[PDB]
Short mmCIF file of C-alpha atoms and ligand atoms in Angstrom, two decimals:
data_model
loop_
_atom_site.label_atom_id
_atom_site.label_comp_id
_atom_site.label_asym_id
_atom_site.label_seq_id
_atom_site.Cartn_x
_atom_site.Cartn_y
_atom_site.Cartn_z
CA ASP A 1 -0.01 0.00 0.00
CA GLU A 2 1.50 3.34 -1.03
CA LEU A 3 1.12 6.50 0.99
CA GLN A 4 -1.43 9.05 -0.18
CA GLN A 5 0.04 11.78 -2.39
CA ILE A 6 -0.63 14.37 0.31
CA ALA A 7 1.52 12.46 2.79
CA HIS A 8 4.40 14.01 0.86
CA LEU A 9 3.30 17.66 0.91
CA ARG A 10 5.68 19.57 3.13
CA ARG A 11 7.67 22.78 3.18
CA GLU A 12 10.78 23.96 5.10
CA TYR A 13 10.22 27.43 6.60
CA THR A 14 13.22 29.73 6.06
CA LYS A 15 11.68 33.19 5.71
CA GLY A 16 12.72 34.18 9.23
CA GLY A 17 12.90 33.52 12.96
CA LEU A 18 11.82 35.04 16.25
CA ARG A 19 14.10 35.57 19.25
CA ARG A 20 13.36 36.76 22.75
CA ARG A 21 15.31 39.94 22.02
CA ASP A 22 12.91 40.74 19.15
CA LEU A 23 9.90 40.73 21.47
CA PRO A 24 8.24 44.02 22.45
CA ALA A 25 6.80 44.43 25.98
CA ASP A 26 3.30 44.68 24.53
CA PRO A 27 2.18 41.70 22.42
CA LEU A 28 -0.11 43.97 20.34
CA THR A 29 3.03 45.80 19.13
CA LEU A 30 4.30 42.58 17.51
CA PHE A 31 0.79 41.66 16.29
CA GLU A 32 0.51 45.06 14.65
CA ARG A 33 3.87 44.59 12.92
CA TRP A 34 2.92 41.15 11.67
CA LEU A 35 -0.53 42.28 10.55
CA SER A 36 1.10 45.18 8.69
CA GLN A 37 3.48 42.81 6.98
CA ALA A 38 0.54 40.60 6.03
CA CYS A 39 -1.27 43.49 4.42
CA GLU A 40 1.91 44.33 2.47
CA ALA A 41 2.64 40.77 1.31
CA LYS A 42 -0.85 41.14 0.00
CA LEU A 43 -2.58 38.20 1.66
CA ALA A 44 -6.10 37.83 0.27
CA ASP A 45 -7.80 38.40 3.63
CA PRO A 46 -5.07 39.52 6.09
CA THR A 47 -7.68 40.12 8.82
CA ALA A 48 -9.36 36.75 8.43
CA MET A 49 -9.05 34.75 11.65
CA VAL A 50 -10.52 31.42 12.77
CA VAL A 51 -12.65 31.70 15.88
CA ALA A 52 -13.29 28.56 17.92
CA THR A 53 -16.20 28.24 20.34
CA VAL A 54 -17.40 25.31 22.47
CA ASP A 55 -20.98 24.02 22.75
CA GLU A 56 -22.55 22.70 25.96
CA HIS A 57 -21.28 19.15 25.37
CA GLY A 58 -17.65 20.12 25.15
CA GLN A 59 -17.61 20.04 21.36
CA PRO A 60 -15.54 22.70 19.58
CA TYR A 61 -16.76 24.60 16.51
CA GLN A 62 -14.89 26.84 14.08
CA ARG A 63 -15.57 29.34 11.31
CA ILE A 64 -13.64 32.27 9.88
CA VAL A 65 -14.55 35.86 10.76
CA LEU A 66 -12.88 39.16 10.10
CA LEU A 67 -10.91 41.18 12.66
CA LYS A 68 -12.54 44.65 12.40
CA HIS A 69 -10.98 46.34 15.41
CA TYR A 70 -8.36 45.70 18.09
CA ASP A 71 -6.79 47.48 21.07
CA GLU A 72 -5.74 46.58 24.61
CA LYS A 73 -9.34 45.70 25.53
CA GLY A 74 -9.48 42.95 22.92
CA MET A 75 -10.10 41.91 19.32
CA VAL A 76 -13.42 42.61 17.64
CA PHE A 77 -15.58 40.83 15.06
CA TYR A 78 -19.19 41.32 13.93
CA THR A 79 -21.78 38.59 13.49
CA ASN A 80 -25.49 37.60 13.70
CA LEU A 81 -26.47 37.41 17.38
CA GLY A 82 -28.79 34.50 16.77
CA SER A 83 -26.06 32.37 15.19
CA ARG A 84 -24.52 29.14 16.39
CA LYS A 85 -21.33 30.86 17.59
CA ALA A 86 -23.30 33.53 19.47
CA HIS A 87 -25.41 30.84 21.15
CA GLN A 88 -22.34 28.88 22.00
CA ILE A 89 -20.66 32.02 23.42
CA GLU A 90 -23.77 32.69 25.51
CA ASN A 91 -23.09 29.52 27.52
CA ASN A 92 -19.29 29.43 27.35
CA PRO A 93 -17.51 32.78 26.80
CA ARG A 94 -14.12 31.11 26.34
CA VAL A 95 -12.87 31.40 22.81
CA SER A 96 -9.75 31.02 20.68
CA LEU A 97 -8.67 33.05 17.68
CA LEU A 98 -6.10 31.99 15.07
CA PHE A 99 -4.67 34.10 12.28
CA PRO A 100 -3.73 31.65 9.51
CA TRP A 101 -0.63 33.44 8.21
CA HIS A 102 1.20 30.29 7.23
CA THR A 103 1.99 31.56 3.74
CA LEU A 104 4.16 34.04 5.67
CA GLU A 105 5.27 31.09 7.85
CA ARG A 106 3.49 32.52 10.91
CA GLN A 107 0.60 32.01 13.35
CA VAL A 108 -0.91 34.23 15.99
CA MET A 109 -3.27 32.55 18.42
CA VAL A 110 -5.29 34.32 21.09
CA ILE A 111 -7.17 33.03 24.09
CA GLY A 112 -9.79 35.13 25.85
CA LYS A 113 -13.40 35.83 26.82
CA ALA A 114 -15.88 36.92 24.17
CA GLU A 115 -18.41 39.58 25.24
CA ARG A 116 -20.99 41.58 23.27
CA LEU A 117 -20.28 44.93 21.70
CA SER A 118 -22.55 47.84 22.74
CA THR A 119 -25.45 48.75 20.49
CA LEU A 120 -23.74 52.11 20.05
CA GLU A 121 -20.44 50.92 18.58
CA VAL A 122 -22.31 48.38 16.44
CA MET A 123 -24.45 51.11 14.91
CA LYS A 124 -21.34 53.16 14.18
CA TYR A 125 -19.82 50.18 12.35
CA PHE A 126 -23.06 48.95 10.73
CA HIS A 127 -23.53 52.20 8.89
CA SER A 128 -20.02 52.06 7.34
CA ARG A 129 -20.91 48.66 5.76
CA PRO A 130 -21.93 48.41 2.03
CA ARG A 131 -25.70 48.89 1.63
CA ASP A 132 -26.23 45.43 0.15
CA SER A 133 -24.47 44.01 3.22
CA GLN A 134 -26.81 45.81 5.62
CA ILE A 135 -29.82 44.36 3.79
CA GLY A 136 -28.18 40.92 3.79
CA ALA A 137 -27.82 41.14 7.56
CA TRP A 138 -31.61 41.36 7.73
CA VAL A 139 -32.12 38.52 5.24
CA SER A 140 -30.08 35.78 6.85
CA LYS A 141 -31.12 33.91 9.96
CA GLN A 142 -27.42 32.84 10.26
CA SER A 143 -26.84 29.16 11.15
CA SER A 144 -30.50 28.11 10.95
CA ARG A 145 -31.32 25.52 8.32
CA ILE A 146 -33.24 26.82 5.31
CA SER A 147 -35.02 24.95 2.53
CA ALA A 148 -33.11 26.46 -0.37
CA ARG A 149 -31.09 29.42 -1.62
CA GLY A 150 -34.17 30.87 -3.26
CA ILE A 151 -35.43 31.77 0.22
CA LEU A 152 -32.57 34.17 0.71
CA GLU A 153 -32.70 35.70 -2.75
CA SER A 154 -36.42 36.24 -2.48
CA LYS A 155 -36.09 37.87 0.92
CA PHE A 156 -33.22 40.08 -0.26
CA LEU A 157 -35.30 41.53 -3.12
CA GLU A 158 -38.22 41.97 -0.77
CA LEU A 159 -36.20 43.90 1.84
CA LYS A 160 -34.33 45.87 -0.80
CA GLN A 161 -37.65 47.10 -2.13
CA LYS A 162 -38.95 47.83 1.37
CA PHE A 163 -35.89 49.86 2.32
CA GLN A 164 -36.03 51.91 -0.92
CA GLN A 165 -33.36 54.63 -0.58
CA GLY A 166 -33.93 55.11 3.14
CA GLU A 167 -31.42 54.04 5.78
CA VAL A 168 -31.30 50.31 6.50
CA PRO A 169 -31.89 49.97 10.23
CA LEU A 170 -29.57 47.93 12.45
CA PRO A 171 -31.21 44.57 13.10
CA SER A 172 -31.54 43.86 16.83
CA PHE A 173 -30.07 40.41 16.07
CA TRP A 174 -26.91 41.72 14.42
CA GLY A 175 -23.96 42.83 16.53
CA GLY A 176 -20.52 41.69 17.53
CA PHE A 177 -18.12 40.47 20.17
CA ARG A 178 -14.99 41.77 21.83
CA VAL A 179 -12.47 39.04 22.74
CA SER A 180 -10.23 39.82 25.70
CA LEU A 181 -6.47 39.15 25.52
CA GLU A 182 -5.60 36.51 28.13
CA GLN A 183 -2.89 34.80 26.09
CA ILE A 184 -1.30 35.37 22.76
CA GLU A 185 1.02 32.94 21.05
CA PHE A 186 3.29 33.86 18.15
CA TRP A 187 4.66 31.18 15.87
CA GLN A 188 7.37 31.67 13.24
CA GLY A 189 8.31 28.59 11.20
CA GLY A 190 11.86 27.28 11.24
CA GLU A 191 13.94 24.49 9.73
CA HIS A 192 13.92 20.81 10.72
CA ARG A 193 10.50 21.46 12.29
CA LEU A 194 12.27 23.48 14.98
CA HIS A 195 10.01 26.58 14.90
CA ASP A 196 10.07 29.56 17.22
CA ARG A 197 7.25 29.87 19.72
CA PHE A 198 6.57 32.56 22.29
CA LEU A 199 3.48 32.63 24.55
CA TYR A 200 2.40 35.86 26.24
CA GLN A 201 0.27 35.09 29.32
CA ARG A 202 -1.62 37.68 31.29
CA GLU A 203 -0.41 37.53 34.90
CA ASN A 204 -2.21 40.26 36.82
CA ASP A 205 -1.16 43.42 35.01
CA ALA A 206 1.97 42.13 33.32
CA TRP A 207 2.77 39.60 30.67
CA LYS A 208 4.59 36.37 31.54
CA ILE A 209 6.48 35.31 28.37
CA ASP A 210 7.83 31.84 27.57
CA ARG A 211 9.35 30.09 24.60
CA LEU A 212 7.46 26.86 23.86
CA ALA A 213 9.05 23.83 22.24
CA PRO A 214 7.85 23.40 18.59
CA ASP B 1 -13.31 58.96 16.67
CA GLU B 2 -12.66 57.36 13.29
CA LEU B 3 -12.94 53.64 12.65
CA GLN B 4 -9.74 51.61 12.49
CA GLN B 5 -8.39 51.16 8.96
CA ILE B 6 -9.11 47.43 9.14
CA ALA B 7 -12.82 48.10 9.77
CA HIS B 8 -12.91 48.81 6.03
CA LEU B 9 -11.20 45.63 4.77
CA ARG B 10 -13.79 43.54 2.97
CA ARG B 11 -14.24 41.56 -0.21
CA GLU B 12 -17.28 40.41 -2.25
CA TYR B 13 -17.02 36.75 -3.16
CA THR B 14 -17.96 36.07 -6.80
CA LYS B 15 -15.75 33.16 -7.81
CA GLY B 16 -18.63 30.71 -7.60
CA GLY B 17 -21.56 29.16 -5.75
CA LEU B 18 -22.73 25.82 -4.43
CA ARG B 19 -26.19 24.37 -5.03
CA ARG B 20 -27.84 21.25 -3.69
CA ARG B 21 -27.73 19.72 -7.16
CA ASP B 22 -23.89 20.07 -7.13
CA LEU B 23 -23.58 17.93 -4.03
CA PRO B 24 -22.29 14.34 -4.30
CA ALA B 25 -23.72 11.64 -1.99
CA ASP B 26 -20.35 11.29 -0.29
CA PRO B 27 -18.95 14.48 1.29
CA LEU B 28 -15.36 13.25 0.72
CA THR B 29 -16.05 13.39 -3.02
CA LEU B 30 -16.65 17.13 -2.82
CA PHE B 31 -13.76 17.58 -0.37
CA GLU B 32 -11.45 15.79 -2.79
CA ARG B 33 -12.56 18.06 -5.65
CA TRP B 34 -12.00 21.18 -3.55
CA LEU B 35 -8.65 19.98 -2.24
CA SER B 36 -7.61 19.20 -5.82
CA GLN B 37 -8.59 22.68 -6.90
CA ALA B 38 -6.65 24.14 -4.00
CA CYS B 39 -3.51 22.28 -5.06
CA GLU B 40 -3.99 23.61 -8.59
CA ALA B 41 -4.63 27.23 -7.63
CA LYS B 42 -1.33 26.70 -5.93
CA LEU B 43 -2.17 27.59 -2.32
CA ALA B 44 1.00 27.69 -0.23
CA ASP B 45 -0.12 24.89 2.09
CA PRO B 46 -3.31 23.35 0.58
CA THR B 47 -3.38 20.65 3.27
CA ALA B 48 -2.95 23.03 6.17
CA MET B 49 -5.97 22.85 8.49
CA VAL B 50 -6.73 24.40 11.85
CA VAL B 51 -7.45 21.83 14.54
CA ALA B 52 -9.34 22.95 17.66
CA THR B 53 -9.24 21.01 20.92
CA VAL B 54 -10.78 21.75 24.35
CA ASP B 55 -9.01 21.62 27.71
CA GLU B 56 -10.60 20.41 30.96
CA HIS B 57 -11.99 23.83 31.80
CA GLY B 58 -13.95 24.24 28.59
CA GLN B 59 -11.30 26.45 27.00
CA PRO B 60 -10.68 25.92 23.26
CA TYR B 61 -7.18 25.85 21.72
CA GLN B 62 -6.09 25.99 18.10
CA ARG B 63 -2.98 25.42 15.96
CA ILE B 64 -2.42 24.48 12.35
CA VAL B 65 -1.45 20.95 11.35
CA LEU B 66 -1.16 19.21 8.01
CA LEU B 67 -3.69 16.77 6.60
CA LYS B 68 -1.46 13.73 5.67
CA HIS B 69 -4.14 11.17 4.92
CA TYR B 70 -7.92 10.86 4.60
CA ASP B 71 -10.55 8.25 3.75
CA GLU B 72 -13.98 7.24 5.08
CA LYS B 73 -12.51 6.41 8.48
CA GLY B 74 -11.36 9.99 9.00
CA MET B 75 -8.71 12.67 8.48
CA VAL B 76 -5.17 12.14 9.71
CA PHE B 77 -2.42 14.37 11.12
CA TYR B 78 0.89 13.62 12.89
CA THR B 79 2.11 15.28 16.09
CA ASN B 80 4.10 14.91 19.34
CA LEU B 81 2.10 12.69 21.72
CA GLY B 82 3.22 14.65 24.73
CA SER B 83 1.97 17.97 23.35
CA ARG B 84 -0.78 20.24 24.59
CA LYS B 85 -3.22 19.12 21.87
CA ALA B 86 -2.52 15.43 22.57
CA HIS B 87 -3.08 15.98 26.31
CA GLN B 88 -6.22 17.87 25.62
CA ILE B 89 -7.43 15.12 23.27
CA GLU B 90 -6.72 12.52 25.98
CA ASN B 91 -9.45 14.05 28.16
CA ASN B 92 -11.83 15.29 25.45
CA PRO B 93 -11.68 13.48 22.06
CA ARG B 94 -14.03 15.97 20.42
CA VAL B 95 -12.29 18.10 17.86
CA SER B 96 -12.94 20.45 14.97
CA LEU B 97 -10.93 20.87 11.75
CA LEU B 98 -11.08 23.88 9.41
CA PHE B 99 -9.43 24.21 6.01
CA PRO B 100 -8.78 27.94 5.55
CA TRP B 101 -9.39 28.14 1.82
CA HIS B 102 -10.81 31.67 1.86
CA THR B 103 -8.49 32.84 -0.90
CA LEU B 104 -10.57 30.44 -3.01
CA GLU B 105 -13.67 31.79 -1.18
CA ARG B 106 -14.26 28.47 0.55
CA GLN B 107 -14.21 26.72 3.95
CA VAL B 108 -14.48 23.07 4.91
CA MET B 109 -15.14 22.34 8.58
CA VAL B 110 -15.21 18.90 10.14
CA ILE B 111 -16.43 17.69 13.49
CA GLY B 112 -15.39 14.32 14.90
CA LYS B 113 -13.52 12.25 17.46
CA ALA B 114 -9.73 12.21 17.46
CA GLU B 115 -8.11 8.83 18.18
CA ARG B 116 -4.48 7.67 18.05
CA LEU B 117 -2.89 6.16 14.99
CA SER B 118 -1.36 2.65 15.39
CA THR B 119 2.40 2.40 15.95
CA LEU B 120 2.51 0.53 12.68
CA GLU B 121 1.07 3.18 10.38
CA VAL B 122 3.10 5.84 12.19
CA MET B 123 6.33 3.98 11.51
CA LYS B 124 5.38 3.68 7.86
CA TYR B 125 4.87 7.45 7.67
CA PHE B 126 7.76 8.42 9.95
CA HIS B 127 10.27 6.79 7.66
CA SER B 128 9.02 8.76 4.61
CA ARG B 129 9.79 12.05 6.46
CA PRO B 130 13.02 14.07 5.72
CA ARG B 131 15.88 12.86 7.93
CA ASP B 132 16.32 16.25 9.64
CA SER B 133 12.61 16.09 10.50
CA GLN B 134 12.95 12.70 12.16
CA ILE B 135 15.79 14.03 14.33
CA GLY B 136 13.78 17.15 15.09
CA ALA B 137 10.95 14.98 16.34
CA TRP B 138 13.36 13.65 18.97
CA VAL B 139 14.66 17.12 19.87
CA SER B 140 11.42 18.92 20.67
CA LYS B 141 9.39 18.31 23.78
CA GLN B 142 6.49 20.02 21.93
CA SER B 143 4.42 22.55 23.96
CA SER B 144 6.68 22.41 27.02
CA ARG B 145 8.35 25.71 27.95
CA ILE B 146 12.09 25.86 27.30
CA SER B 147 14.69 28.39 28.40
CA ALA B 148 15.91 29.39 24.92
CA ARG B 149 16.27 28.33 21.30
CA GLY B 150 19.86 27.30 21.97
CA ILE B 151 18.47 24.26 23.86
CA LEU B 152 16.93 22.92 20.66
CA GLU B 153 19.87 23.66 18.41
CA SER B 154 22.26 22.03 20.86
CA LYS B 155 20.10 18.95 21.16
CA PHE B 156 19.68 18.70 17.38
CA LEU B 157 23.46 18.59 16.79
CA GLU B 158 23.84 16.12 19.64
CA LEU B 159 21.21 13.72 18.23
CA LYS B 160 22.38 14.16 14.68
CA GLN B 161 25.85 13.06 15.75
CA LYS B 162 24.43 10.15 17.75
CA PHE B 163 22.31 8.89 14.85
CA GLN B 164 25.26 9.08 12.42
CA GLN B 165 24.04 7.52 9.12
CA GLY B 166 21.91 4.88 10.89
CA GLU B 167 18.11 4.93 10.87
CA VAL B 168 16.49 7.47 13.15
CA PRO B 169 14.17 5.46 15.40
CA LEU B 170 10.51 6.43 15.87
CA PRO B 171 10.21 8.23 19.19
CA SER B 172 7.59 6.57 21.44
CA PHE B 173 6.21 10.10 22.03
CA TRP B 174 5.65 10.89 18.34
CA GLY B 175 2.56 9.67 16.55
CA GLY B 176 -0.70 10.93 15.18
CA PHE B 177 -4.47 11.08 15.31
CA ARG B 178 -7.32 9.98 13.09
CA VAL B 179 -10.37 12.30 13.23
CA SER B 180 -13.70 10.64 12.48
CA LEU B 181 -16.21 12.32 10.16
CA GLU B 182 -19.36 13.14 12.13
CA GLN B 183 -20.16 16.37 10.32
CA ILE B 184 -18.68 18.25 7.44
CA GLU B 185 -19.67 21.75 6.43
CA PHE B 186 -18.85 23.28 3.09
CA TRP B 187 -18.89 27.06 2.64
CA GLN B 188 -18.67 28.90 -0.68
CA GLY B 189 -18.69 32.71 -0.49
CA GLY B 190 -21.40 34.68 -2.23
CA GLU B 191 -22.46 38.30 -2.78
CA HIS B 192 -24.15 40.60 -0.27
CA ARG B 193 -22.88 38.26 2.47
CA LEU B 194 -25.36 35.65 1.23
CA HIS B 195 -22.98 32.66 1.04
CA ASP B 196 -23.81 29.02 0.30
CA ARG B 197 -23.64 26.61 3.21
CA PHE B 198 -24.27 22.87 3.29
CA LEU B 199 -23.83 20.70 6.40
CA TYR B 200 -23.42 16.92 6.07
CA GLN B 201 -24.40 15.22 9.31
CA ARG B 202 -23.86 11.57 10.06
CA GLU B 203 -27.21 9.96 10.84
CA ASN B 204 -26.64 6.27 11.39
CA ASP B 205 -25.17 5.11 8.07
CA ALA B 206 -26.39 7.93 5.86
CA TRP B 207 -25.75 11.64 5.60
CA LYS B 208 -28.42 14.16 6.50
CA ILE B 209 -27.74 17.30 4.41
CA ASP B 210 -29.01 20.80 5.08
CA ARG B 211 -28.40 24.29 3.70
CA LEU B 212 -27.56 26.67 6.53
CA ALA B 213 -28.28 30.40 6.42
CA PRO B 214 -25.03 32.45 5.92
C1 LIG C 301 -12.88 35.24 4.64
C2 LIG C 301 -14.16 35.05 5.49
C3 LIG C 301 -14.62 36.08 6.37
C4 LIG C 301 -15.82 35.89 7.16
N1 LIG C 301 -16.21 36.84 8.11
C5 LIG C 301 -17.30 36.78 8.90
C6 LIG C 301 -17.64 37.76 9.91
O1 LIG C 301 -16.90 38.72 10.15
N2 LIG C 301 -18.82 37.60 10.62
C7 LIG C 301 -19.73 36.47 10.43
O2 LIG C 301 -20.70 36.45 11.08
N3 LIG C 301 -19.42 35.52 9.52
C8 LIG C 301 -18.23 35.59 8.76
N4 LIG C 301 -17.83 34.62 7.82
C9 LIG C 301 -18.74 33.41 7.69
C10 LIG C 301 -18.45 32.46 8.93
O3 LIG C 301 -17.33 31.73 8.50
C11 LIG C 301 -19.56 31.52 9.31
O4 LIG C 301 -19.95 30.68 8.20
C12 LIG C 301 -20.80 32.24 9.84
O5 LIG C 301 -20.47 33.25 10.76
C13 LIG C 301 -21.78 31.29 10.58
O6 LIG C 301 -20.99 30.53 11.72
P1 LIG C 301 -21.78 29.89 12.90
O7 LIG C 301 -22.89 29.03 12.25
O8 LIG C 301 -20.74 29.03 13.62
O9 LIG C 301 -22.44 30.76 13.85
C14 LIG C 301 -16.63 34.65 7.00
C15 LIG C 301 -16.13 33.62 6.15
C16 LIG C 301 -14.90 33.76 5.41
C17 LIG C 301 -14.47 32.58 4.64
C1 LIG C 302 1.60 25.33 7.91
C2 LIG C 302 1.79 24.64 9.25
C3 LIG C 302 1.77 23.23 9.38
C4 LIG C 302 1.93 22.61 10.65
N1 LIG C 302 1.78 21.22 10.82
C5 LIG C 302 1.92 20.53 11.97
C6 LIG C 302 1.69 19.10 12.07
O1 LIG C 302 1.32 18.41 11.13
N2 LIG C 302 1.94 18.47 13.32
C7 LIG C 302 2.34 19.24 14.50
O2 LIG C 302 2.51 18.59 15.50
N3 LIG C 302 2.49 20.57 14.44
C8 LIG C 302 2.30 21.28 13.24
N4 LIG C 302 2.41 22.64 13.10
C9 LIG C 302 2.78 23.40 14.35
C10 LIG C 302 1.45 23.57 15.23
O3 LIG C 302 0.80 24.67 14.67
C11 LIG C 302 1.64 23.75 16.71
O4 LIG C 302 2.45 24.91 16.96
C12 LIG C 302 2.27 22.55 17.41
O5 LIG C 302 1.71 21.33 16.99
C13 LIG C 302 2.14 22.59 18.95
O6 LIG C 302 0.59 22.76 19.32
P1 LIG C 302 0.11 22.37 20.73
O7 LIG C 302 1.06 23.10 21.71
O8 LIG C 302 -1.32 22.91 20.79
O9 LIG C 302 0.11 20.98 21.08
C14 LIG C 302 2.22 23.43 11.88
C15 LIG C 302 2.19 24.84 11.74
C16 LIG C 302 1.97 25.49 10.49
C17 LIG C 302 1.89 26.97 10.52
C1 LIG C 303 5.95 20.46 14.22
C2 LIG C 303 5.57 19.87 12.89
N1 LIG C 303 5.44 18.46 12.74
C3 LIG C 303 5.08 17.89 11.50
C4 LIG C 303 4.81 18.75 10.42
C5 LIG C 303 4.43 18.18 9.05
O1 LIG C 303 4.51 16.81 9.04
P1 LIG C 303 5.87 16.39 8.34
O2 LIG C 303 7.11 17.10 9.06
O3 LIG C 303 6.09 14.80 8.38
O4 LIG C 303 5.82 16.93 6.82
C6 LIG C 303 4.92 20.12 10.53
C7 LIG C 303 4.64 21.02 9.27
O5 LIG C 303 4.77 22.27 9.38
C8 LIG C 303 5.30 20.69 11.79
O6 LIG C 303 5.42 22.05 11.91
C1 LIG C 304 -21.55 36.69 7.06
C2 LIG C 304 -20.51 37.79 7.10
N1 LIG C 304 -20.74 38.93 7.91
C3 LIG C 304 -19.78 39.99 7.96
C4 LIG C 304 -18.59 39.87 7.20
C5 LIG C 304 -17.53 40.95 7.19
O1 LIG C 304 -17.96 42.05 7.93
P1 LIG C 304 -18.48 43.14 6.87
O2 LIG C 304 -19.58 42.51 5.92
O3 LIG C 304 -19.10 44.42 7.64
O4 LIG C 304 -17.23 43.54 5.96
C6 LIG C 304 -18.36 38.73 6.38
C7 LIG C 304 -17.05 38.66 5.53
O5 LIG C 304 -16.85 37.67 4.80
C8 LIG C 304 -19.34 37.67 6.32
O6 LIG C 304 -19.13 36.60 5.54
#
């Protein structure tokens, strides 16, 4: 029996490395640098990140969402408040975020608590979104099973007509979450599978920082 | 206060769509097609997937790993058996896998139970790995905190000398997991945030298939 073709897919990572002397006191400083370099390398969706949530049975779920804001208080993403992730977050606020920057031979993983954004900040953001996107927010009962795509298309045309030139109101079931920064791991690929790993861990007000074996 | 620059990063997805009539009876048939198209579009790491595990406190963790094999019995990846993920899996076998194919405006997410590969199949695979990688497997106590990178480099040279031309044995703490296929979601981006979503759910021997609102 021969190995599957994919068993042979592999790549040595020689773009760079990460040493303790390269680390800033604030993890967000390094994240900002990396994000900036991702935007410059021209990744298709530099702000795309995978958010993992856990349901009531201890089962993890994942889906990509976009990072739309970040500061010391956490990383932000917008979503339908009636969705599977939102319902999972309701019961277990613990989440994980992963920026899949492996084309740049890097990973950034964050652990923290997800909490709802205020209606106010959501409104601010909602009105900067493309008009068809605002309508679409109204159309989709995110995560719920639907009979066919026609249901969405029909509803979209219906709502577009209804909203005719006026402002599309913010649906009460559309909002977002702010994920606190409890831990942040940075990964930079290396050779011989000996990558660089540094984990920032919130310890009271400061950050405990350790290198983790690859 | 102006919105952060990233608040404005967004993309409309018009590469394609996914209709119920395009769905094969076996989800792996569609996954194979998509994977094939990812290898052709030349994604940097087409087999890279994000695996999420959950620790004993209900906290999710993520890290990328490579898909090295897959068939009806599940998807396979190799890793250090003493690592954080392996320890988390020990207590909670429930995992989630996500192929970040958003440059192709797609996502494939799998839910299932992670179980250990047999020593036998691991050996088979371990000996097809580059020699420096086999040594590296011995060097790194994956996930454990280490004092500095020098510790790894030193150990690597030490083991390389020790193994001098002979076969690098399979470390007892290096192996892999097979993730069963309980559910598999396919996502294909659309316009106005009205994407196509189909969830395959194992129901006894067959697959229950539903379109999920975007
Ligand atoms: C590149 C990309 C960006 C996405 N961004 C978001 C987002 O910011 N908010 C959102 O609700 N869904 C977003 N999605 C769709 C989600 O992946 C997911 O399908 C949806 O939120 C429903 O997940 P849920 O059923 O777990 O609640 C994005 C998908 C991709 C591939
Ligand atoms: C493109 C890419 C492929 C990777 N593949 C693997 C893999 O197949 N097995 C592995 O153990 N680690 C792999 N890693 C490293 C993991 O992301 C992770 O850092 C490591 O397994 C330790 O995770 P843990 O501490 O949660 O146990 C890969 C990283 C990247 C960015
Ligand atoms: C730590 C680690 N182990 C294994 C792999 C891939 O499996 P293999 O080295 O046999 O190609 C990777 C790929 O990035 C990795 O980072
Ligand atoms: C369902 C959904 N909501 C929101 C977003 C992105 O936020 P915004 O539409 O305001 O750019 C995406 C991006 O892909 C999405 O798929």
